[PDB]
Amino acid sequence: GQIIMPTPGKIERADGRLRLQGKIRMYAEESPGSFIRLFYEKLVPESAVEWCKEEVNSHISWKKDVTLPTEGYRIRVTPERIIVEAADDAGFIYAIQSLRQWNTGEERGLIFPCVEITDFPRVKWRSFMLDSGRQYQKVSTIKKYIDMASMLKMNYFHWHLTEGLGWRIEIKRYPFLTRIGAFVGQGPEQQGFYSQEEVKEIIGYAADRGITVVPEIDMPGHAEAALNAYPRLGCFNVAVKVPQNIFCAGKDSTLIFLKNVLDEVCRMFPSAYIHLGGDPKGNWDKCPDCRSRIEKEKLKDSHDLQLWFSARMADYLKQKGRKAIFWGDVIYKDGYSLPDNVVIQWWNWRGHRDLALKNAVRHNYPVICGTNYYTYLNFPLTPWKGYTQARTFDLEDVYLRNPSYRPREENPLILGMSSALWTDDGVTESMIDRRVFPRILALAEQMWHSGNPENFDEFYGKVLSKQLWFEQQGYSFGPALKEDAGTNYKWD
Ligand SMILES: [Zn+2]
């Protein structure tokens, strides 16, 4: 119709349009099972689809083109038919997302202006993270943001499931982690967890729309809720206040406990990547078990202990065939060397600029670019509670000055970009969209669109032109420019 966001790599308009109303005949070269549920949900109900044996009689065909890049697709709309080609199922899903936006919506059914679109992602890692540790969001809300990620052609949903204020991932072997740990928070929407059944539902929902769900199980820090469940995981069988105390690396029982947890996490989450956090040595510096461990392993200090600990967990993931992601803090200082399945998520630009990026390259660790400036969508456009002027930014900042956007080819160690919505300071479900939109559109554009010229005025014009369509999909917009926010914008 008008435009597709994020911007496709190549769009060539042709004369005419194709109207599809009534029973729609379709042909697929291979079993369409993996992408077809999304098509039925977003474009044409299964009741209106007739599957054809002969392609020539179909209105839409779904064909493999092995010459396309991974996740790439081609769409040709002619006055007679649509031919959709992809190298893999991800490509078909992204083609479907483009068809959703290409439909004019002028009438009932579908109307597609004739076109050839050829499209593929700039970077291999394109993620959105939601903080479900500090706040609980209902399952339908988790689905909403997975659906958003797919809509914007991302491929990973990073699910931050454990925090001092909430352990929300059910572990059958240790029932107290959720039965106690998911109810330690006392504020609005801070109670609840995701059962293994709900996780199975979420994984299936995500798979239907090309999203891999990357769980984050934080260790050794952010353990307060877990320690409420199992105080013996700490240095001593002692009680622990939950802040509106970390896992003891010195106890083999703690490592064994955490390995048992990862056993279940790996059964539930087929993701090749598991995030272990790794970002407070108060308890360690005095623990007989942590100081003993430093001795036995020939470590330097408390920090080196955290590296050793991170190394043991990553090695465990390695023998399970998974990669381990850690926040970049881990490698600010050299020390005990991390195994070759480690990935680094670079985040603290404001405090440390590109330190983590630089140390990750020195050590040959792949990197995800997720810097707070300007991928942390929890930073409002104007000050709010714990966010002062220093932790605010707008659509111009993210589009024009994002340290995480690096369009120059570069080291293949750089995997891509992340975006995040942390729920610090009581961000309830009703408060999420006004932070996420429209700035996530600039992040999605940087992740997907080729590094071709597109100035802010053109990009912002597209945002405004597509806004009501995005709202009709259920996504409310917050202010785009600092000026839009005025003097007393309501962030709560
Ligand atoms: Zn300890």
Residue 250 alpha carbon to ligand 1 centre in Å: 5
Cβ atoms within 10 Å of 41's Cβ, excluding its own:
14
Domain boundary among 74, 90, 121: 121
The answer to whether 400 touches 456, Cβ cutoff 8 Å, is: yes
157 and 271 both lie in a single domain: yes
Three-state DSSP state, 273: strand
Burial (CB < 10 A; 0-12, 13-18, 19+), residue 412, is exposed
**In the chain, which residues are last before a break of more than 2.5 Å from C to the next N?**
244, 279
Residue 248 annotated as lining a ligand binding site? yes
Domain boundary among 121, 146, 176: 121
Q: How far apart are CA 401 and CA 253, in angstroms?
A: 46
Q: How far apart are CA 261 and CA 276, in angstroms?
A: 12
59 and 206 both lie in a single domain: no
Question: One-letter amino acid identity for 387?
Answer: Y
Q: Is the peptide bond before 8 cis (omega within 30 degrees of 0)?
A: no
Q: How far apart are CA 63 and CA 313, in angstroms?
A: 42
Q: At 105, which CATH number?
A: 3.30.379.10
255 and 116 both lie in a single domain: no
**Determination technique for this entry:** X-ray
Q: At 131, which CATH number?
A: 3.20.20.80
337 and 475 both lie in a single domain: yes
334 and 379 both lie in a single domain: yes
282 and 331 both lie in a single domain: yes
Query: What is the resolution of the experimental data for this entry, in Å?
Result: 1.8
Residue 254 alpha carbon to ligand 1 centre in Å: 9
- Which structural domain range is residue 17 located in? 1-121
109 and 155 both lie in a single domain: no
Residue 251 alpha carbon to ligand 1 centre in Å: 7
Residues whose CB is less than 8 angstroms from the CB of residue 401 and which lie 6 or more positions away in sequence, other chains included: 373, 374
Contacts 24+ apart (CB under 8 A), 466-470: 466/2, 466/3, 466/5, 466/101, 467/438, 469/101, 469/105, 470/437
The answer to whether 29 touches 62, Cβ cutoff 8 Å, is: yes
Domain boundary among 105, 121, 137: 121
Residue 5 alpha carbon to ligand 1 centre in Å: 49
Residue 289 alpha carbon to ligand 1 centre in Å: 5
Note residues around ion ligand 1 (Cβ under 5 angstroms). Answer: 235, 248, 250, 287, 289-290
Residue 307 alpha carbon to ligand 1 centre in Å: 14
Residue 405 alpha carbon to ligand 1 centre in Å: 39
Residue 10 alpha carbon to ligand 1 centre in Å: 56
215 and 320 both lie in a single domain: yes
Q: How far apart are CA 427 and CA 431, in angstroms?
A: 6
Residue 283 alpha carbon to ligand 1 centre in Å: 6
**Six token digits for residue 324:** 């381990």
248 and 312 both lie in a single domain: yes
Residue 238 alpha carbon to ligand 1 centre in Å: 12
> 255-285 b/e with 16+ CB inside 10 Å = b?
bebbeebbebbbebbebebbbbbbeebebbe
Helical ranges in 152-284 per DSSP H: 176-179, 196-207, 224-229, 252-268
Residue 298 alpha carbon to ligand 1 centre in Å: 16
Number of domains in the chain: 2
Residue 235 annotated as lining a ligand binding site? yes
Beta strands in 308-375 (DSSP E): 323-327, 342-346, 367-369
106 and 220 both lie in a single domain: no
User: Shortest CA distance to 85 belongs to which of 129, 14, 35, 19?
Assistant: 35
Q: Is the peptide bond before 6 cis (omega within 30 degrees of 0)?
A: yes
99 and 162 both lie in a single domain: no
Residue 25, strand partner residues:
50
116 and 138 both lie in a single domain: no
User: Shortest CA distance to 178 belongs to which of 187, 188, 169, 186?
Assistant: 169
Residue 287 annotated as lining a ligand binding site? yes
Residue 443 alpha carbon to ligand 1 centre in Å: 40
Residue 306 alpha carbon to ligand 1 centre in Å: 11
| End-to-end CA gap in the chain | 36
Residue 174 alpha carbon to ligand 1 centre in Å: 20
